[PDB]
């Protein structure tokens, strides 16, 4: 299947409590493989997957330098954006950044991306052509003019559709024994009366990888769009994921409902009936 490499960065100002908190994480697909946390003891980029540990000391030094430069750049940007948005120095604010690339199953480049946020809202994003920016408001447009003048998109593009792809291919080879595994969901349904007259049906998907999945309830084949409770997909903590979906039904009518389970590891979509 296709694969992705993504880095996520969060910087949070803490006025009067020292320098901003800074957390960086790198993922291949849904598997974390490196982290940096400004409050951790080592002050180094650190491995989080077995197949990255073989990288040499020059790699860990370079990744540490480059994540610390990202941190220092965010620290400056926190102060700049506070000015653009006419905010005071007293409040805590947040910058989030995600970037990365996707490749196909034969390794070809598919897509590159970079998006930035301020206080949990869009700030600026690189467009899919990797040549243009889209600013979310008139403050962010100041950054866009700066980045246009600096020819930042061209530099970033050489990474997102070149360097990023080259490293992602190396990691997929480093990690082949585990990154090319897909685990299909193990599924079952449970039934819980909530009174003499109604019961909760809950459709369960467990042990699946990657995280992407769809659970939907039907009643006589009609999608029960509302009336369904659906939790966020969640990590088991062993590298796999879990999800459930529930519906409240009249006692005696359970067999009119079906749960439908779609996951890239399933050969056919699964239908469950109580």
């Amino acid at each position: 299947g296709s694969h992705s490499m993504r880095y996520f960065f969060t910087s949070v100002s803490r006025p009067g409590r020292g320098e901003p908190r800074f957390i960086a994480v790198g993922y291949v697909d849904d598997t974390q493989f490196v982290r940096f946390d400004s409050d951790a003891a080592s002050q180094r980029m650190e491995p989080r997957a077995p197949w990255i540990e073989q990288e040499g000391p020059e790699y860990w030094d370079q990744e540490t330098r480059n994540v610390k430069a990202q941190s220092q750049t965010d620290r400056v940007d926190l102060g700049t954006l506070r000015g653009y948005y006419n905010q005071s120095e007293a409040g805590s604010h947040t910058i989030q950044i995600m970037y990365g690339c996707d490749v196909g199953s034969d390794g070809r480049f598919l897509r590159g991306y970079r998006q930035d946020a301020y206080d949990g809202k869009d700030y600026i994003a690189l467009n899919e052509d990797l040549r243009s920016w889209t600013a979310a408001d008139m403050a962010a447009q100041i950054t866009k003019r700066k980045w246009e003048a600096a020819h930042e998109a061209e530099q970033l593009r050489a990474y997102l559709d070149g360097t990023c792809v080259e490293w992602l291919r190396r990691y997929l080879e480093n990690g082949k024994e585990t990154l090319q595994r897909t685990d299909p969901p193990k599924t079952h349904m449970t039934h819980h009366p909530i009174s003499d007259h109604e019961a909760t049906l809950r459709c369960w998907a467990l042990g699946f990888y990657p995280a992407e999945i769809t659970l939907t309830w039907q009643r006589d084949g009609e999608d029960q769009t509302q009336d369904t409770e659906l939790v966020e997909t969640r990590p088991a903590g062993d590298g796999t994921f879990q999800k459930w979906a529930a519906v409240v039904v009249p006692s005696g009518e359970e067999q009119r409902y079906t749960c439908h389970v779609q996951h890239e590891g399933l050969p056919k979509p699964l239908t469950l009936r109580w």
Binding site: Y7, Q62, N66, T73, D77, L81, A150
Partner: peptide, 9 residues
């Protein structure tokens, strides 16, 4: 691996 080089906003 991370991108290097940083244009401030």
């Amino acid at each position: 691996a991370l991108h290097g080089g940083w244009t401030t906003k």
